[PDB]
Nucleic acid binder design. Structure first.
Lengths: 48, 309, 309, 309, 48, 48, 309, 48
DNA sequence: TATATTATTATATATTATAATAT
DNA sequence: ATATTATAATATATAATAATATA
């Protein structure tokens, strides 16, 4: 977990996603070693 | 097991349109880069989704098929964009009914695949993979002018003429193993408003007629008896269509009344009313639209042997 | 002991539609295959499930009579599909009321009888037995264009022809044991309201009349006595409708009207009027409905010798 | 003879209602036939349940005069189903105010006198004896038209003219044993706002007031005393109605203007005005709120006799 | 109870009752070795 | 759970069935590590 | 690389408007202030977004842009004005579509560049930093005259002649870097319609023939096969304009016609046609504007090859 | 929950914003040691 | 522990709105 | 050049359910 993950959660919430599933998608594929846009991409690929 | 065509020359109709789109295809092949974003405008019945698939295969790219009414929130758009990758394409239809925030999201996403919406805190810098969004709506007047101007490829999809529709019927019967008389092919092509989806549906109905009432392949006589049994004249009339014609020429004297009134009289939708009427009414010149109403021409009245008072 | 035509061949009232459905029955039986998807729509209440049972009798295979609330989830309809077998059928209603997730679940189900489902993402493909998918709604216009385009046969339903209505009245009177007159049957067919159920109610009430006023006898003059003692007009007007006409040409004198003022002056609920008396005459088209106030058409003006602005 | 009269000739209601479906049902009874379904509807407070109970008692059949909103559960519905026997009759009040389960358990009863109950589990076939349901609703527009197909008879109610009101008040005063003049009956009918059952209630109240200050005879000075006491004269103008119309003529004087404005002028809730005050004068030619606004005829001005061109 | 009374009780909860009142309705007017319809009919007037 | 069992449970969850009843129907009728389509068929053979 | 114009020297447009905005910028810089609220009513987008970018480039500040219908709430406008820093540039297109409360809040912005709001009601006094409002709308005719009266700077725009196409060929094709013939550019201007957007499309689409075919021949049909159908007699117009001329000549006889009648004949928005096709077609002398009807000039008759009525 | 907070909410109500949106905006920013006008200004500068 | 005390998910229904028109 | 108001959406008071400190 880092500031990129919390920023991803907040951006998905402000986009309109439900906070619990947005947080689950963020935590499933975190950007610990990669950018926030890439882990947001991988999370958004999670629920297709 | 489908008879859906998947070839560029399969939709040989609208040859200038097909040639221009072939030019765009060879352009994208020569570009080896991002395509210009596309908004094709065309009424249904023409296999426009099939056309999008065919040009997607000619790109050698995977195609995902959906529509504007399906989407309701730009997060769904972002999910679809993430599912797409480099060398992909997304079939989108009826983009006019869509949330605007999707449109301001997609403005940088069609500028340079970018997304810089706000999360204060850190905003996203989502530069998507290289893939070009395309649109295959019906009418672009109801589409927004900025989206109409910003999208590169625009084209009209039109109903096919009798020769191409008859050729399509012949080749589909070839896929079906069936044999069609050229005169029967001509009459079914000049019927059904010259639209390949409806032409194929009519081909299925006529081949079912030849399976039941006929004892072999379809000739002009067999096809004509099928159309008479289905009550299909040379104008390709439907019973509901004939009913609307009778109401407009008799109850309303040409029908100079709005589409709402006639649609409620049928108890049917406005969009259903128009997408039935215009592709054959306009091409036959039997009604024009006035602010008073879609009043019929003198040609429609004199079609049924009725003299203009 | 409700009304039922035992076979589609035995069905009367829409003889042309009877001919095409006989064509379809022979198409399924002669090809020995599952019949195409046939789209059914027309009047809202007509015993469509009974018609599906007749079609089931014609095939000889069962049809699971299901509806929108019956199939509100994809799970139970998928369960029924698993319980379905080769050459079966499944009646579905309120498809417009059904969720789009149901629609995407049934996309491979009628797309050559398959099934696709997902599970880090994984794909699971399933097959389905071949059957005849049945789609019947009160109004087919709410259906999405790609699904109805992917669908095959479409069948319109309507109230019978006036000759057909009189024939059905004669058949029901023979069922009811009434000594009807063909002139009286034509009278009832003129007053048929577009509703066979309410028409049969009228046969019951005039049977009561001929029991109590006639000597158990039905003639044209007996029918005229019954439908002069009641709300009668050969179009279908009532003294409800006559009162509405008198007020409409009397209060605002053939102009657009305020619905609140209509309810206050008329002393009936406006919802009752627009649900009962208005929709039939809108189907008759004798009014036009405007967003600033409903105005009757020229039929009311000629009905009482009135001028046109 | 009671608070509510019993014989049909006691309550000379609408002459069409009094003529049709009374002698007819009196002749049709005893034919070993269970009667079909029937609606009476109209303005509230008119004792339509009393009329149905009357109809049952000249039918001489056991009746359970019930209220629908009391019987919300299917269990008490089935209890009333097993309460009666073959060819009997049931009375329900305000059927349109019910939970849907009521209607989808009475649908098989309407169909084939059938009590289909559910408990793989399987529903159980439970027949019912032949019966009759009569409908007693204020408004049945919100009632579903499957029910409107199931119910075979509808009867409307309307404001009563002064002759029927005078006959009703004279008969009910003879029931009450009064010495009212025919001019007394006319003045009571004029003071009352129609509504013959509520008019009977008003007659009972006026009889109590007259017995408080005198004998059972009714004199024009006593009628004036009652009109001033109830603040409603023979013109039917309420005190609030008279004050508001005086306010309207004091400023706009028949000027067609908007409602919000007059409501703010009167400092009264406009929706309460809508559902109480102007409908009563709107059944007559008094109030004509236009697209321009309120219009009041000089017939209402004749209460004080001042009018302008 | 018997299968007929059990199916009756199941229908009673299936239309909105609760099991103990269905039980005392069955016990108040028990049915003997016949088809379910008749004594459920006297039960439904017996519950009045 | 096996791969076919887990895929069937996820499929019935996506179909709208509750995960508990989906798992019970999937593990009740068929055998062990059989073809996913037919054991999904057998799990959805159940009715109420 | 951005092919769009960055500096005012890079800008291509009306020389008169260019000198006018040059002297406005010089007057603003001589006062050591940003440019005041300049009103630019004319073609939306064409020379307006570019003009706002020119103002941002000359002032060297960040720019924020929005639209008229986007700002539904005055609070959003106050939020963005508070977010706007000192001297920043604001671009709002379709300024005539603001709700009047938005304009009431906006009036102190071009009064004294402060939030001097006029509003149980508290006058909020927010520190509003000075900013430049690029007032963009279709015309000043429908503008509210407090707003048009309060604008310190007023100017116009017009559709450009062939000089802008020539300057585009000089500049952006050099930015493109690919060879374009001068007479080839002149024959490209046969369809460029004097539009920078159409010129950008043509610059993107001349390369299409270059990448399909490596020989690189340049002929007139080679330049036309990018849009292979001529869609015009000469000089700019398209298939939509061809349909417009066909419905003026064949249907409306090229004479007077109701504006809504012609709009419903086109089956398109009157405002869209009047903003896009009407002013340019009037500029080349094909239509004169008359209130009694939209009559076409001599060019429409002579280009069609028919006599002038 | 504060006098300055209530003044900001009333000002945003008079400016056209909803009371619920005004409460959300004044709770979105931790305006401390600031005047009401400048706290409103930085709140407008906050999210955007 | 089970119970009053907080969360949070629909559903009509009294609102807001527009157009087109007399005036 | 005002209003008005006849049809069209809309947003929340009132129904519900799910944790949670506490005698």
């Amino acid at each position: 977990v880092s500031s990129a993950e919390a920023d991803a959660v907040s951006a998905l919430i402000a986009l309109g996603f439900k906070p619990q599933e947005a947080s689950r998608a963020v935590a499933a594929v975190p950007g610990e070693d990669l950018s926030s846009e890439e882990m947001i991409r991988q999370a958004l690929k999670g629920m297709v | 097991r489908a008879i859906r065509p998947l070839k560029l020359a399969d939709y040989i109709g609208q040859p200038s349109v097909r040639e221009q789109m072939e030019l765009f295809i060879h352009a994208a092949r020569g570009r080896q880069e991002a395509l210009d974003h596309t908004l094709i405008f065309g009424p249904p019945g023409l296999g426009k989704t099939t056309l999008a698939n065919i040009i997607a295969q000619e790109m050698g790219v995977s195609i995902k098929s959906t529509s504007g009414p399906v989407l309701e929130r730009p997060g769904d758009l972002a999910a679809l964009l993430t599912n797409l990758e480099a060398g992909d394409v997304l079939f989108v239809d009826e983009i006019h009914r869509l949330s605007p925030i999707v449109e301001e999201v997609l403005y940088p996403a069609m500028e340079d695949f970018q997304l810089d919406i706000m999360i204060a805190a850190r905003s996203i810098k989502l530069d998507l993979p290289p893939f070009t969004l395309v649109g295959a709506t019906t009418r672009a007047g109801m589409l927004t002018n900025p989206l109409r101007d910003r999208f590169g490829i625009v084209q009209r999809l039109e109903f096919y003429n009798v020769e191409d529709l008859a050729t399509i019927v012949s080749r589909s019967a070839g896929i079906l193993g069936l044999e069609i008389e050229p005169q029967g092919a001509a009459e079914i092509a000049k019927r059904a408003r010259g639209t390949p989806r409806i032409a194929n549906r009519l081909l299925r109905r006529v081949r079912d007629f030849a399976e039941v009432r006929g004892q072999g392949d379809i000739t002009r006589v067999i096809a004509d008896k099928a159309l008479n049994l289905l009550d299909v004249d040379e104008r390709g009339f439907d019973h509901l269509d004939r009913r609307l014609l009778l109401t407009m020429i008799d109850k309303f004297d040409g029908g100079p009344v709005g589409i709402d009134n006639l649609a409620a009289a049928l108890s049917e939708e406005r969009h259903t009313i128009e997408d039935v009427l215009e592709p054959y009414l306009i091409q036959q010149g039997y009604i024009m639209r006035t602010p008073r109403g879609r009043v019929v021409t003198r040609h429609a009245y004199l079609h049924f042997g009725l003299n203009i008072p």
